[PDB]
PDB file of C-alpha atoms (C1' of nucleotides) in Angstrom:
ATOM      1  CA  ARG A 293     -30.464  59.769  10.000  1.00 58.71           C
ATOM      2  CA  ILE A 294     -27.250  61.356  11.239  1.00 57.40           C
ATOM      3  CA  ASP A 295     -25.961  59.834  14.458  1.00 56.00           C
ATOM      4  CA  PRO A 296     -25.502  62.561  17.095  1.00 54.89           C
ATOM      5  CA  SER A 297     -22.268  63.296  18.923  1.00 53.07           C
ATOM      6  CA  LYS A 298     -23.981  62.638  22.279  1.00 50.27           C
ATOM      7  CA  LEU A 299     -22.246  59.306  22.767  1.00 47.28           C
ATOM      8  CA  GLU A 300     -19.074  57.728  24.169  1.00 46.61           C
ATOM      9  CA  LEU A 301     -16.543  57.332  21.364  1.00 50.14           C
ATOM     10  CA  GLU A 302     -13.546  55.089  21.960  1.00 47.35           C
ATOM     11  CA  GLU A 303     -11.444  55.905  18.841  1.00 46.69           C
ATOM     12  CA  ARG A 304      -8.406  53.656  18.567  1.00 46.40           C
ATOM     13  CA  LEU A 305      -6.310  54.001  15.422  1.00 49.38           C
ATOM     14  CA  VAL A 306      -5.572  51.388  12.759  1.00 49.24           C
ATOM     15  CA  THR A 307      -2.635  52.411  10.548  1.00 49.03           C
ATOM     16  CA  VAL A 308      -0.476  55.376   9.598  1.00 48.52           C
ATOM     17  CA  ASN A 309       0.737  55.962   6.041  1.00 52.61           C
ATOM     18  CA  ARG A 310       3.514  58.399   5.197  1.00 53.40           C
ATOM     19  CA  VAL A 311       2.532  59.921   1.901  1.00 55.18           C
ATOM     20  CA  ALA A 312       4.721  61.983  -0.408  1.00 56.50           C
ATOM     21  CA  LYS A 313       4.453  64.790  -2.945  1.00 62.61           C
ATOM     22  CA  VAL A 314       7.209  65.911  -5.298  1.00 66.48           C
ATOM     23  CA  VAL A 315       8.052  69.605  -5.617  1.00 67.05           C
ATOM     24  CA  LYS A 316      10.819  71.594  -7.399  1.00 65.87           C
ATOM     25  CA  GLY A 317      13.237  70.969  -4.554  1.00 65.94           C
ATOM     26  CA  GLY A 318      12.396  67.404  -3.687  1.00 64.25           C
ATOM     27  CA  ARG A 319       9.840  65.311  -1.896  1.00 66.29           C
ATOM     28  CA  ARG A 320       7.412  66.394   0.817  1.00 64.12           C
ATOM     29  CA  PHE A 321       6.614  63.709   3.375  1.00 67.79           C
ATOM     30  CA  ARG A 322       3.298  64.144   5.168  1.00 66.30           C
ATOM     31  CA  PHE A 323       1.241  61.585   7.036  1.00 67.23           C
ATOM     32  CA  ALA A 324      -2.090  59.914   6.398  1.00 69.52           C
ATOM     33  CA  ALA A 325      -4.403  58.519   9.044  1.00 71.58           C
ATOM     34  CA  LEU A 326      -7.691  56.705   9.535  1.00 70.62           C
ATOM     35  CA  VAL A 327      -9.213  55.870  12.909  1.00 70.14           C
ATOM     36  CA  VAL A 328     -12.187  53.612  13.506  1.00 74.38           C
ATOM     37  CA  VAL A 329     -14.379  55.477  15.992  1.00 74.62           C
ATOM     38  CA  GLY A 330     -17.405  54.368  17.965  1.00 77.05           C
ATOM     39  CA  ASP A 331     -18.890  53.070  21.167  1.00 78.41           C
ATOM     40  CA  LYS A 332     -19.404  49.432  22.060  1.00 78.85           C
ATOM     41  CA  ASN A 333     -23.171  49.768  21.601  1.00 83.25           C
ATOM     42  CA  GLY A 334     -23.790  49.684  17.877  1.00 85.57           C
ATOM     43  CA  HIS A 335     -22.465  52.960  16.432  1.00 83.24           C
ATOM     44  CA  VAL A 336     -19.373  52.738  14.211  1.00 82.54           C
ATOM     45  CA  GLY A 337     -17.705  55.362  12.056  1.00 83.97           C
ATOM     46  CA  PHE A 338     -14.466  56.869  10.852  1.00 84.34           C
ATOM     47  CA  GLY A 339     -12.966  59.735   8.903  1.00 82.65           C
ATOM     48  CA  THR A 340      -9.791  60.379   7.017  1.00 81.24           C
ATOM     49  CA  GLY A 341      -6.752  61.875   8.674  1.00 82.22           C
ATOM     50  CA  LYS A 342      -4.471  64.242   6.785  1.00 84.53           C
ATOM     51  CA  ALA A 343      -1.856  66.571   8.256  1.00 83.92           C
ATOM     52  CA  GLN A 344       1.844  67.372   8.110  1.00 82.24           C
ATOM     53  CA  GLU A 345       2.493  65.640  11.446  1.00 81.35           C
ATOM     54  CA  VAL A 346       1.678  62.464  13.332  1.00 85.24           C
ATOM     55  CA  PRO A 347      -0.692  63.628  16.115  1.00 89.95           C
ATOM     56  CA  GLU A 348      -2.749  66.331  14.395  1.00 90.72           C
ATOM     57  CA  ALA A 349      -3.886  63.743  11.863  1.00 92.66           C
ATOM     58  CA  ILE A 350      -5.171  61.759  14.842  1.00 93.00           C
ATOM     59  CA  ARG A 351      -7.144  64.858  15.848  1.00 94.25           C
ATOM     60  CA  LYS A 352      -8.698  65.492  12.448  1.00 92.55           C
ATOM     61  CA  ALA A 353      -9.726  61.855  12.072  1.00 88.59           C
ATOM     62  CA  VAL A 354     -12.207  62.405  14.906  1.00 89.78           C
ATOM     63  CA  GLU A 355     -13.940  65.308  13.106  1.00 88.67           C
ATOM     64  CA  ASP A 356     -15.235  63.405  10.073  1.00 88.57           C
ATOM     65  CA  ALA A 357     -15.812  60.464  12.395  1.00 87.84           C
ATOM     66  CA  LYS A 358     -18.296  62.644  14.256  1.00 88.49           C
ATOM     67  CA  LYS A 359     -19.560  63.873  10.882  1.00 87.78           C
ATOM     68  CA  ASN A 360     -20.143  60.326   9.601  1.00 87.61           C
ATOM     69  CA  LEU A 361     -21.303  57.542  11.910  1.00 86.23           C
ATOM     70  CA  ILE A 362     -23.562  54.597  11.121  1.00 86.39           C
ATOM     71  CA  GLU A 363     -25.586  52.154  13.186  1.00 86.65           C
ATOM     72  CA  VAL A 364     -25.562  48.350  13.198  1.00 84.76           C
ATOM     73  CA  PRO A 365     -28.232  45.917  14.457  1.00 82.09           C
ATOM     74  CA  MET A 366     -27.047  43.904  17.451  1.00 79.58           C
ATOM     75  CA  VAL A 367     -29.428  40.922  17.512  1.00 80.35           C
ATOM     76  CA  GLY A 368     -28.017  38.636  20.213  1.00 81.07           C
ATOM     77  CA  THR A 369     -24.546  40.279  19.956  1.00 79.30           C
ATOM     78  CA  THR A 370     -24.455  38.968  16.368  1.00 78.07           C
ATOM     79  CA  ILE A 371     -25.235  40.266  12.944  1.00 74.92           C
ATOM     80  CA  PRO A 372     -28.854  39.144  12.403  1.00 74.49           C
ATOM     81  CA  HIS A 373     -28.214  37.417   9.068  1.00 77.19           C
ATOM     82  CA  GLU A 374     -25.640  36.783   6.373  1.00 76.51           C
ATOM     83  CA  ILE A 375     -24.448  39.445   3.928  1.00 80.78           C
ATOM     84  CA  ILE A 376     -21.607  40.121   1.458  1.00 82.43           C
ATOM     85  CA  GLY A 377     -20.447  43.702   0.894  1.00 80.11           C
ATOM     86  CA  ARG A 378     -18.780  44.623  -2.386  1.00 79.80           C
ATOM     87  CA  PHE A 379     -17.537  48.222  -2.289  1.00 81.54           C
ATOM     88  CA  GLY A 380     -14.595  48.901  -4.582  1.00 82.44           C
ATOM     89  CA  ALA A 381     -12.581  45.718  -5.287  1.00 84.74           C
ATOM     90  CA  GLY A 382     -12.363  44.727  -1.641  1.00 82.54           C
ATOM     91  CA  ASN A 383     -14.978  42.093  -0.974  1.00 80.48           C
ATOM     92  CA  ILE A 384     -15.533  41.299   2.684  1.00 77.77           C
ATOM     93  CA  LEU A 385     -18.379  38.953   3.526  1.00 75.09           C
ATOM     94  CA  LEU A 386     -20.074  38.766   6.906  1.00 75.34           C
ATOM     95  CA  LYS A 387     -21.396  35.610   8.532  1.00 75.27           C
ATOM     96  CA  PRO A 388     -23.205  35.275  11.856  1.00 73.98           C
ATOM     97  CA  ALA A 389     -22.467  32.422  14.226  1.00 74.07           C
ATOM     98  CA  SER A 390     -23.137  31.284  17.779  1.00 73.75           C
ATOM     99  CA  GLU A 391     -22.130  33.377  20.762  1.00 75.26           C
ATOM    100  CA  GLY A 392     -18.962  31.516  21.672  1.00 74.26           C
ATOM    101  CA  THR A 393     -17.324  32.080  18.304  1.00 75.43           C
ATOM    102  CA  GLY A 394     -15.471  35.310  19.043  1.00 74.85           C
ATOM    103  CA  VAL A 395     -14.295  37.878  16.522  1.00 75.59           C
ATOM    104  CA  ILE A 396     -12.453  36.228  13.629  1.00 73.25           C
ATOM    105  CA  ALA A 397     -11.749  39.010  11.153  1.00 71.56           C
ATOM    106  CA  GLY A 398      -8.950  40.721   9.297  1.00 71.44           C
ATOM    107  CA  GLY A 399      -6.451  43.136  10.817  1.00 71.72           C
ATOM    108  CA  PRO A 400      -8.236  46.476  10.383  1.00 71.50           C
ATOM    109  CA  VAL A 401     -11.622  44.769  10.378  1.00 67.46           C
ATOM    110  CA  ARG A 402     -11.030  43.409  13.896  1.00 70.65           C
ATOM    111  CA  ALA A 403     -10.642  46.999  15.057  1.00 70.22           C
ATOM    112  CA  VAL A 404     -14.118  47.701  13.647  1.00 72.97           C
ATOM    113  CA  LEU A 405     -16.301  44.927  15.031  1.00 74.85           C
ATOM    114  CA  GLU A 406     -15.092  45.383  18.604  1.00 78.55           C
ATOM    115  CA  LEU A 407     -15.954  49.049  18.110  1.00 80.00           C
ATOM    116  CA  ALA A 408     -19.500  47.916  17.441  1.00 82.28           C
ATOM    117  CA  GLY A 409     -19.869  45.852  20.591  1.00 82.77           C
ATOM    118  CA  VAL A 410     -20.832  42.930  18.350  1.00 81.66           C
ATOM    119  CA  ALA A 411     -18.601  40.020  19.323  1.00 85.38           C
ATOM    120  CA  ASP A 412     -19.788  37.182  17.023  1.00 82.38           C
ATOM    121  CA  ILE A 413     -18.624  37.566  13.401  1.00 84.01           C
ATOM    122  CA  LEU A 414     -16.983  35.216  10.951  1.00 86.42           C
ATOM    123  CA  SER A 415     -15.468  37.046   7.993  1.00 88.78           C
ATOM    124  CA  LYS A 416     -12.830  36.689   5.289  1.00 88.41           C
ATOM    125  CA  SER A 417     -11.167  39.453   3.266  1.00 86.80           C
ATOM    126  CA  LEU A 418     -11.787  38.305  -0.295  1.00 88.95           C
ATOM    127  CA  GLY A 419     -10.557  41.484  -1.969  1.00 86.58           C
ATOM    128  CA  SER A 420      -7.470  43.583  -1.617  1.00 85.16           C
ATOM    129  CA  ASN A 421      -5.351  44.215   1.461  1.00 87.15           C
ATOM    130  CA  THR A 422      -5.785  47.971   1.694  1.00 84.59           C
ATOM    131  CA  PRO A 423      -6.912  49.549   4.958  1.00 83.04           C
ATOM    132  CA  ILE A 424      -9.338  52.213   3.724  1.00 85.33           C
ATOM    133  CA  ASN A 425     -11.257  49.986   1.350  1.00 88.27           C
ATOM    134  CA  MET A 426     -11.507  47.041   3.731  1.00 90.71           C
ATOM    135  CA  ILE A 427     -13.213  49.342   6.219  1.00 90.22           C
ATOM    136  CA  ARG A 428     -15.332  50.550   3.312  1.00 90.95           C
ATOM    137  CA  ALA A 429     -16.007  46.867   2.657  1.00 90.35           C
ATOM    138  CA  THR A 430     -17.452  46.500   6.158  1.00 94.45           C
ATOM    139  CA  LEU A 431     -19.722  49.483   6.781  1.00 93.22           C
ATOM    140  CA  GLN A 432     -21.253  49.332   3.299  1.00 93.19           C
ATOM    141  CA  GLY A 433     -22.336  45.788   4.081  1.00 93.70           C
ATOM    142  CA  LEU A 434     -23.297  46.825   7.603  1.00 93.93           C
ATOM    143  CA  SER A 435     -25.394  49.625   6.103  1.00 90.70           C
ATOM    144  CA  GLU A 436     -27.373  47.049   4.118  1.00 93.04           C
ATOM    145  CA  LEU A 437     -28.376  45.088   7.208  1.00 95.41           C
ATOM    146  CA  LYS A 438     -31.982  44.713   8.311  1.00 93.31           C
ATOM    147  CA  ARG A 439     -33.794  44.205  11.600  1.00 91.27           C
ATOM    148  CA  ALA A 440     -36.195  41.385  12.394  1.00 91.03           C
ATOM    149  CA  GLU A 441     -39.036  43.582  13.639  1.00 87.87           C
ATOM    150  CA  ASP A 442     -38.416  46.104  10.854  1.00 84.84           C
ATOM    151  CA  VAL A 443     -38.893  43.878   7.797  1.00 87.28           C
ATOM    152  CA  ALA A 444     -42.057  42.407   9.297  1.00 87.49           C
ATOM    153  CA  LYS A 445     -43.213  46.022   9.478  1.00 88.20           C
ATOM    154  CA  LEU A 446     -41.997  46.370   5.884  1.00 89.10           C
ATOM    155  CA  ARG A 447     -43.934  43.279   4.823  1.00 87.56           C
ATOM    156  CA  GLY A 448     -46.892  44.119   7.048  1.00 85.29           C
ATOM    157  CA  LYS A 449     -46.378  40.717   8.649  1.00 88.38           C
ATOM    158  CA  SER A 450     -45.793  39.196  12.080  1.00 87.08           C
ATOM    159  CA  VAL A 451     -42.292  39.220  13.532  1.00 86.78           C
ATOM    160  CA  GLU A 452     -42.662  35.675  14.881  1.00 86.99           C
ATOM    161  CA  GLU A 453     -43.841  34.633  11.420  1.00 89.41           C
ATOM    162  CA  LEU A 454     -40.323  35.473  10.212  1.00 90.78           C
ATOM    163  CA  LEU A 455     -39.086  32.884  12.713  1.00 90.11           C
ATOM    164  CA  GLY A 456     -42.086  30.550  12.576  1.00 84.17           C
TER     165      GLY A 456
ATOM    166  C1'   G B 124     -18.356  26.667  11.704  1.00 84.54           C
ATOM    167  C1'   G B 125     -14.129  30.659   6.817  1.00 85.60           C
ATOM    168  C1'   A B 126      -8.200  36.110  10.431  1.00 85.37           C
ATOM    169  C1'   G B 127      -3.889  37.781   7.409  1.00 84.74           C
ATOM    170  C1'   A B 128       1.135  40.259   6.728  1.00 83.83           C
ATOM    171  C1'   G B 129       6.161  42.371   3.727  1.00 83.56           C
ATOM    172  C1'   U B 130       7.018  43.501  -1.539  1.00 84.07           C
ATOM    173  C1'   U B 131       6.597  46.864  -7.918  1.00 80.59           C
ATOM    174  C1'   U B 132       5.958  53.019  -6.838  1.00 82.95           C
ATOM    175  C1'   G B 133       8.311  59.724  -5.410  1.00 83.11           C
ATOM    176  C1'   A B 134       3.225  58.961  -3.698  1.00 86.11           C
ATOM    177  C1'   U B 135      -2.179  56.121  -4.433  1.00 86.26           C
ATOM    178  C1'   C B 136      -5.546  52.290  -6.056  1.00 87.66           C
ATOM    179  C1'   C B 137      -6.031  48.043  -8.649  1.00 87.52           C
ATOM    180  C1'   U B 138      -3.888  44.043 -11.169  1.00 89.51           C
ATOM    181  C1'   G B 139      -0.702  39.977 -10.763  1.00 91.51           C
ATOM    182  C1'   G B 140       3.284  36.966  -9.018  1.00 88.20           C
ATOM    183  C1'   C B 141       6.106  34.862  -5.203  1.00 89.74           C
ATOM    184  C1'   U B 142       7.362  35.168  -0.019  1.00 90.63           C
ATOM    185  C1'   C B 143       5.515  34.372   5.331  1.00 93.17           C
ATOM    186  C1'   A B 144       2.886  32.928   9.908  1.00 92.57           C
ATOM    187  C1'   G B 145      -0.202  27.171  10.508  1.00 90.69           C
ATOM    188  C1'   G B 146      -0.982  21.781  10.393  1.00 88.82           C
ATOM    189  C1'   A B 147       1.323  16.806   9.572  1.00 89.14           C
ATOM    190  C1'   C B 148       5.650  13.066   8.607  1.00 88.82           C
ATOM    191  C1'   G B 149       7.186   5.406   8.391  1.00 90.70           C
ATOM    192  C1'   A B 150      11.009  11.285   7.572  1.00 90.81           C
ATOM    193  C1'   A B 151      16.802  12.433   7.609  1.00 90.79           C
ATOM    194  C1'   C B 152      20.543  15.969   9.446  1.00 91.84           C
ATOM    195  C1'   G B 153      22.898  19.666  13.440  1.00 90.94           C
ATOM    196  C1'   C B 154      23.175  20.367  18.795  1.00 93.29           C
ATOM    197  C1'   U B 155      21.933  18.441  23.271  1.00 95.41           C
ATOM    198  C1'   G B 156      19.360  14.632  26.129  1.00 94.46           C
ATOM    199  C1'   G B 157      16.845  11.923  32.957  1.00 92.76           C
ATOM    200  C1'   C B 158      12.576   8.528  33.146  1.00 94.71           C
ATOM    201  C1'   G B 159       7.796   5.942  32.270  1.00 95.30           C
ATOM    202  C1'   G B 160       3.601   3.933  29.556  1.00 93.86           C
ATOM    203  C1'   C B 161       1.369   3.187  24.165  1.00 92.85           C
ATOM    204  C1'   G B 162       2.753   2.854  18.810  1.00 92.33           C
ATOM    205  C1'   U B 163       5.904   2.542  14.438  1.00 93.49           C
ATOM    206  C1'   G B 164      10.653   1.256  12.716  1.00 93.13           C
ATOM    207  C1'   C B 165      14.393  -0.844   4.559  1.00 93.84           C
ATOM    208  C1'   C B 166      10.173   3.815   0.875  1.00 92.24           C
ATOM    209  C1'   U B 167      16.224   3.107  -2.714  1.00 92.80           C
ATOM    210  C1'   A B 168      17.700  -2.888  -4.577  1.00 91.82           C
ATOM    211  C1'   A B 169      11.172  -7.819  -6.018  1.00 92.58           C
ATOM    212  C1'   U B 170      19.779  -6.925  -5.699  1.00 92.06           C
ATOM    213  C1'   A B 171      22.868 -11.022  -4.061  1.00 93.84           C
ATOM    214  C1'   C B 172      22.932 -14.205   0.768  1.00 93.10           C
ATOM    215  C1'   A B 173      27.252 -17.172   5.614  1.00 92.73           C
ATOM    216  C1'   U B 174      24.687 -19.822  10.044  1.00 89.55           C
ATOM    217  C1'   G B 175      20.627 -21.544  12.985  1.00 91.57           C
ATOM    218  C1'   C B 176      15.569 -22.140  13.379  1.00 87.93           C
ATOM    219  C1'   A B 177      10.234 -20.831  10.427  1.00 86.96           C
ATOM    220  C1'   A B 178       5.298 -27.773   9.203  1.00 85.07           C
ATOM    221  C1'   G B 179       4.502 -31.531  10.866  1.00 85.28           C
ATOM    222  C1'   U B 180       1.322 -34.916  13.165  1.00 87.48           C
ATOM    223  C1'   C B 181      -1.107 -40.668  14.224  1.00 85.75           C
ATOM    224  C1'   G B 182       2.222 -47.354  17.540  1.00 85.15           C
ATOM    225  C1'   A B 183      -5.480 -46.350  19.209  1.00 83.47           C
ATOM    226  C1'   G B 184      -3.865 -47.140  10.349  1.00 82.76           C
ATOM    227  C1'   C B 185       0.240 -51.152  10.029  1.00 82.72           C
ATOM    228  C1'   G B 186       4.298 -54.692   9.344  1.00 84.09           C
ATOM    229  C1'   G B 187       9.053 -55.005  11.376  1.00 85.02           C
ATOM    230  C1'   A B 188      12.900 -53.424  14.112  1.00 88.83           C
ATOM    231  C1'   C B 189      13.877 -51.449  18.865  1.00 86.57           C
ATOM    232  C1'   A B 190      14.706 -51.720  24.067  1.00 83.85           C
ATOM    233  C1'   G B 191      12.269 -54.142  28.101  1.00 82.07           C
ATOM    234  C1'   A B 192      12.290 -57.904  32.590  1.00 80.27           C
ATOM    235  C1'   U B 193       6.493 -59.779  34.869  1.00 81.17           C
ATOM    236  C1'   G B 194       8.373 -64.159  35.786  1.00 78.90           C
ATOM    237  C1'   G B 195      10.197 -68.965  33.587  1.00 80.43           C
ATOM    238  C1'   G B 196      14.700 -71.856  32.798  1.00 83.29           C
ATOM    239  C1'   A B 197      20.154 -72.455  31.710  1.00 83.89           C
ATOM    240  C1'   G B 198      25.861 -72.185  32.510  1.00 80.46           C
ATOM    241  C1'   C B 199      29.010 -70.926  36.218  1.00 82.45           C
ATOM    242  C1'   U B 200      33.471 -66.982  38.331  1.00 83.77           C
ATOM    243  C1'   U B 201      28.934 -64.843  42.749  1.00 84.62           C
ATOM    244  C1'   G B 202      30.704 -61.883  39.454  1.00 85.97           C
ATOM    245  C1'   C B 203      27.750 -62.600  35.631  1.00 82.15           C
ATOM    246  C1'   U B 204      26.311 -64.615  30.869  1.00 82.81           C
TER     247        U B 204
END
RNA sequence: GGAGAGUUUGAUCCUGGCUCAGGACGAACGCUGGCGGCGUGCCUAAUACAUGCAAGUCGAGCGGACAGAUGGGAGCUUGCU
């Protein structure tokens, strides 16, 4: 479903890109923005930020962030299993680990996983070093996650039978 | 038990290069330098070497030399032979 706006969003920015456009006179410098937005309890999202200024792009990032959020399973403050997302030439894989392992991730990706609350991820940016698509490389993989009690309900099977 | 970042462009994504942060040296150089353990210390020339030492041991394997004086005796200077 759609995640409601009845939460506590923390919304720290990642990068700012100044982005041009060439008219009869000369250039026109605007700014681009993207802000990873969420709580620390499993809801992550973002939106684009476009303006003619610095701070109003920060404002309009929050709108589509509250229009588009997504939820992640938090089994033991980890991802419950291993997955590899492949959206648009930026491959970023996701590996779970033990609870002491911290958050080892790429630059913009590290400002995503701490905005999940999930603190145990190994990852490695296989694909390109572009900030929009690396975040698209994360949530697309995080969308394809599964829960332990859910797939047993999908299989019509016991949850403990998935473990033993 | 797996971090990435600058760069082609007016601007964007890819693509693709190199660059960079890290870790080691039997390392050298520049500048400085108080000490203590533990460890290494000719990779090039297996090129040439002054000087000293680096493999001898058994007299219970053996002949002889080699000193020896336990005493014995000799010639006298009492110093010796």
